[PDB]
Design a protein around this ligand. Structure first.
Ligand SMILES: Cc1cc2nc3c(=O)[nH]c(=O)nc-3n(C[C@H](O)[C@H](O)[C@H](O)COP(=O)(O)O)c2cc1C
Ligand SMILES: Cc1cc2nc3c(=O)[nH]c(=O)nc-3n(C[C@H](O)[C@H](O)[C@H](O)COP(=O)(O)O)c2cc1C
Ligand SMILES: O=C(O)c1[nH]c(=O)[nH]c(=O)c1CCc1cccc(C(F)(F)F)c1
Ligand SMILES: O=C(O)c1[nH]c(=O)[nH]c(=O)c1CCc1cccc(C(F)(F)F)c1
Lengths: 313, 313
């Protein structure tokens, strides 16, 4: 019985990793994730220049999940590239680097410089397509023409296999269209579903106030709120992108939640809110819990059940 | 006490009603909602002809909410019109009739017939814009040019104040576009936010199976999963449509949840999943709970706090 995976020409001890943005912003964070029992790690989505991000409070968690409008605080691309080129211990586990430029040009500039490090050290790119583009237009993955432009430009500039981080969709026509755009790009080898459910609003009844300061309290939702949404997206893209891997993200708190993601199609399984709340010890727990479900069912490997969710009649 | 309010030229004993689709399909259902303590009721969204809807199982509930792909089973427009015209007791409470035709023409045909009954009896129209669209396109409310056409045609055909049931949105640019569309139509006097969060997927770990038969287990989510989504949409439209009313729907299980909807801007508060699970007794509980929270805070009216959610700075 084992959790091993071999994919994207890397070996992973288990499918668990952080979700971008959680426990991955500083060198301290990345050393911490490297020391944990996760199978991989991803660095904080970066911009060319460092960002402070939004005013605090900008993240809050609750029993059913989290809300955030962080504003992309990060130490800048050069820092993350340095970590990938010089600091990361690749004998411990594989590293993904997430990028999230504010324009197609900012992304092209980053990927051009990443590429030799990707080639030499094996760092893997995750391109975050929730980047805002022009304010007053939707986020890039909700503007299909922009998404196509971004992927054309990044594919030409980078020239190596990479993956994309997608927001959730809520309409079958959007699953269809979004997957068809991704399927135009053979270098897109993995699809991470999902980023946070956009622009929710948590209100505290006692104070009669929103709980985060930016955007009048509106921000992206993670956690237990979003698990069925995340599963839907994992499976929609699993079905529509048969030549790509799907990584699942959203609502993972337990080995059972991971097992559902993997039934839906997930290869790697990312952990955001639950990791933010519990800390890196969560990885040993998730591994144990997943293995126990596998033993009960008689499953010896992940591929025995990946994508094998049953439908009714 | 008491929670009585006036709107749309009608008096309501309290702000609570069923959500369309729940406990409102048959004459029995509508008599049961009328006998309840709710302040109003809404009939099941209808088509010109009766529909059997999708194969069962097509609804399932769980601790955090519900998933459905009902396929609009309904007794047909003639039935609901006859209920509004001949059977409903208007001395007990107001009635809303929901329509969701499969094309603009079908909506126009239904609303031309409804108009005289609305004049004579005061039945209120809720137009459900989560309805099918032309090939390749998403649901009408997700296609802003279709939505505008539908509202143009229904406004002309009906000629009387009505409301619109909206799906959730997840992007601030979409809130801006959708609200601008609604604000073109002066006859649209109330906006109900939100319909179910579209195309989630619930998977049962033991069986390794989806839990509803239609659409490979994909369906709309309601209940606790969707409360922050619902609040965000209520507040977004409340802010953007100052000359309209907003009705809140989504994730109401308690008077506290109703309180939060009202703080966000809700005039009426609709109850779907929790009503399906608990039955019509829920209405006395919600009223008692809401009045208890108001008393603890010193609020004597709903107007004192409707839309008064506080932001940080
Ligand atoms: C504080 C915070 C920061 C985030 N920053 C990023 C980011 O920089 N890039 C990204 O792709 N997603 C980001 N996300 C989204 C997470 O990666 C993840 O997609 C989302 O939280 C859902 O997973 P969960 O339900 O496990 O939280 C962030 C989420 C949180 C809570
Ligand atoms: C079984 C079922 C049937 C529904 N039918 C309709 C419908 O006919 N028309 C409609 O506008 N919404 C319909 N909905 C959506 C609800 O009105 C409501 O918007 C949704 O369930 C979110 O509220 P909740 O969190 O209270 O469940 C239905 C929901 C359920 C669960
Ligand atoms: O940093 C974030 O707010 C964030 N939060 C998430 O839940 N997921 C994400 O992908 C991100 C980063 C993307 C993002 C999301 C919202 C705003 C901006 C900004 F404009 F600041 F550049 C960037
Ligand atoms: O009956 C539904 O499945 C349903 N469930 C919801 O959570 N919200 C809804 O608004 C609806 C009805 C959506 C709808 C609206 C109009 C037509 C049709 C079709 F005939 F295609 F089944 C479906």
């Amino acid at each position: 019985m084992c959790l091993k995976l071999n994919l994207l020409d890397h070996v992973f001890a288990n499918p668990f990793m952080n979700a971008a943005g959680v426990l991955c912003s500083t060198e301290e964070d990345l050393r911490c994730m490297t020391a944990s029992s996760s199978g991989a790690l991803v660095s904080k989505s970066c911009t060319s220049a460092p960002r402070d991000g939004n005013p605090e409070p900008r993240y809050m968690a609750f029993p059913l999940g989290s809300i955030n409008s962080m504003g992309l605080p990060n130490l800048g691309f050069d820092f993350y590239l340095k970590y990938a080129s010089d600091l990361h211990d690749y004998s411990k586990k594989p590293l993904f680097l997430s990028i999230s430029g504010l324009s197609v040009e900012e992304n092209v500039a980053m990927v051009r410089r990443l590429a030799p490090v990707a080639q030499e050290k094996g760092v893997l790119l995750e391109l975050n397509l929730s980047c805002p583009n022009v304010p007053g237009k939707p986020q890039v993955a909700y503007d299909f023409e922009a998404m196509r432009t971004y992927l054309q430009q990044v594919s030409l500039a980078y020239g190596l296999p990479f993956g994309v981080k997608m927001p959730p969709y809520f309409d079958i026509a959007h699953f269809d269209t979004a997957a068809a755009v991704l399927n135009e790009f053979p270098l897109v080898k993995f699809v991470t579903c999902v980023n946070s459910v956009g622009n929710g609003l948590v209100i505290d009844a006692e104070s009669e106030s929103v709980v985060i300061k930016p955007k009048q309290g509106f921000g992206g939702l993670g956690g237990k709120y979003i698990l069925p949404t995340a599963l839907a997206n994992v499976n929609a893209f699993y079905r529509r992108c048969p030549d790509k891997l799907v990584f699942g993200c959203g609502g993972v708190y337990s080995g059972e939640d991971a097992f559902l993601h993997i039934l839906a199609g997930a290869s790697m399984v990312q952990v955001g809110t639950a990791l933010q709340e519990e800390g890196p010890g969560i990885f040993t727990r998730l591994e144990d819990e997943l293995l126990e479900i596998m033993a009960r069912k008689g499953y010896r490997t992940l591929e025995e059940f990946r994508g094998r969710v049953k439908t009714i009649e």
